[model samples]
Target: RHSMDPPTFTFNFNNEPWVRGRHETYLCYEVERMHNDTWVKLNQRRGFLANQAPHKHGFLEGRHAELCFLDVIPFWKLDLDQDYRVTCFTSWSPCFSCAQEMAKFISKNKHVSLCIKTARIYDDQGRAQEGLRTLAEAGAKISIMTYSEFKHCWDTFVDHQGAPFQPWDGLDEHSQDLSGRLRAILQN
Candidate 1:
């Protein structure tokens, strides 16, 4: 296991939330819908180590975030005898390659319906848009997270007790901007 401080990023014009030398970020959580109409936490992972790892293609931001999530899938045995609406929440959107891989994975696992919610989309010099498009084509829903979703995720997935989610300045605006961009990407 490895530990790393939050990874920072250069200015990404397409990504509204991009900030240089920023910390207090990079979180991933997966929630599965339960029979009682409430979401149950399945798994959660962070990407500090992936950010610090040496890589040829460069760190895809939270590229390794999903890697840890994959480990939880097998132990839960979610592959069989279950119909689940699984939603994954990530601080940074999956890169193009990650999106493609996730799309393919979900295609094979028909028992699982996935909806990816992110604070921002990683278009990666415009190359990542196509990957998001591919995911949509493959029946996976991808978009910016909403406030209600945030509360639900916090309530269900977070370990904090009785801590209510508070809106941050510009968070809604940024989310709307990203959401609009995602819609445009999907419509095209």
Candidate 2:
């Protein structure tokens, strides 16, 4: 009964892709636009995405799932008149290269606003940390996902078949820890 449908199924048939430290990363996104100055979710403007590039020589290629989202965005039939807000719920935060490109894209497209919330950090120091800061400097909010956000992603992206979001033990503690790290990184 919805206008938008994209062969959605539960991640790994059961949301296992969200487990921290998993190699396979998933990115789920929703698009919203200003409605009388308030953001309104655009129906059918969401997708479950992953790194779409092909592997080479049994090795992972560089086209991260986040890149795939950027690639596929222009294909959507969105109204061109209004500024749109995009929110991403990713299993792992963007790598350095992905972060760079996302910031560049944001700078190029003034009509779009992007905020990314990651279930896990990719790396804490050096290029990865700097990449996160770069995204923030470009006006994109980069932060850790909270427990409520985890549940929200579950409800929005998971095809749980009738089950509810089951919070893993220490989930909030982990989030708080990660949150602190991000705050510290940004503050310094």
Candidate 3:
């Protein structure tokens, strides 16, 4: 096993796969603690969570990678006395069911700000689009990842060795088109 101060943290990190595909989502999470808006002190925590691959043969947590975060969060014993922001960098936009739960989580936990930046749009017809809107309505900042986001996620989350992120012939253009698609999805 890899070594780390917190064994649980290492276990979660070790589960991350080196490569992922459309069938699975790779999610990197960040937590920020909001302190003394009455003053000027701030702190943030960066960590990785377990990603969902193919169905784990009836496993509850295997339903969706992003959704698993909801189940795992209460274990953190979050400080309700303070406010925080939760961020995610994920490969695909969540499906309708996953989106519904995420939006509901935010509604129930007002002290936590929720945001998601996805690498690709998962528009399963207009249903996922509506789910995105519902998430926005519930105060989540759902966005499409651009080059900057891609780079950050790569450098921070990937086990890339010494290699740099190399984009394909039309990476940005493709990202832009999908982004425009989502913008229109929400505009309507």
Candidate 4:
């Protein structure tokens, strides 16, 4: 169980294996999958999105909550095949306590390459920078993204040009499509 008042945590997903350089592709796919015709039908049948987009206030908050929920599950839970699903989804930053557990596991099982990341929370960018420095001293292979890459992601993928009235922030072809496309690239 998390400490009574859970402390925040952040993870650098770029280092994760599955979504390492292919995160944008997976992200794009997940969105597409979630919003696709089949998913839409299921969601509508389940009364998931009864109201349209404009009617949904706090949409971004809901998204953050959804991501947080997905982040908490243990890597083993998803490693149903014992195939190590740790590096699969890097966007998630597990809670602080989880990090300690992961570190212990790593120390114990030196032979096993635990693909999942250990989470750490910092108050802000400065804190993350300082923490990264400390981790780097301990031999962590992490490098911050370049400003241009970050800007490119923010402009094309994340915020999406900030178009005048696009309304939705989704990619032109949802996440499912993007993920599939990414898989093809990664497979090759």
Go through the candidates in order and give the clash count of each. Answer: 0, 0, 0, 6
lDDT of 2 by residue, 1-188 (tens): 22112223223212222464356568889999998999999868877777665667667675788889999888886666778999998878888888999999999888889989888777846699888889999999888887788878777777665678777667787888889988987776
Candidate scoring better on TM-score of 2 and 4: 2
TM-score of each: 0.71, 0.84, 0.78, 0.24
**Candidate with better lDDT, 2 vs 4:** 2
Query: Considering every candidate listed, which one attains the maximal lDDT?
Result: 2
Worst 10 residues of 3 by lDDT: 1-10
lDDT of 2 at 24: 58
Residues 112-163 of candidate 3 have per-residue lDDT tens digits of: 8888987777777868988999999999998877778766765666666656
Per-model C-alpha RMSD:
5.6, 4.3, 6.4, 15.9
lDDT, each prediction: 0.61, 0.77, 0.70, 0.27
Model 2: per-residue Cα lDDT at residue 7: 27
In candidate 1, stretches whose alpha carbon ends up further than 4 angstroms from where it belongs are: 1-18, 22-27, 33-63, 159-161
lDDT, candidate 2, equals: 0.77
Ranking by lDDT: 2, 3, 1, 4
Q: Candidate 3: which pairs clash?
A: none
**Model 4 quality (TM-score):** 0.24
By summed lDDT, the worst window of 10 consecutive residues in model 4 runs over 43-52
The number of the candidate with the highest TM-score is 2
- Please write out the lDDT profile of model 1 over residues 63-141, one tens digit for every residue: 3555555545555566466667766666667667777788888888887788877767766777688888898899988
Query: What does candidate 4's lDDT look like per residue over 123-152, in tens digits?
Result: 243333343333333332322222332233
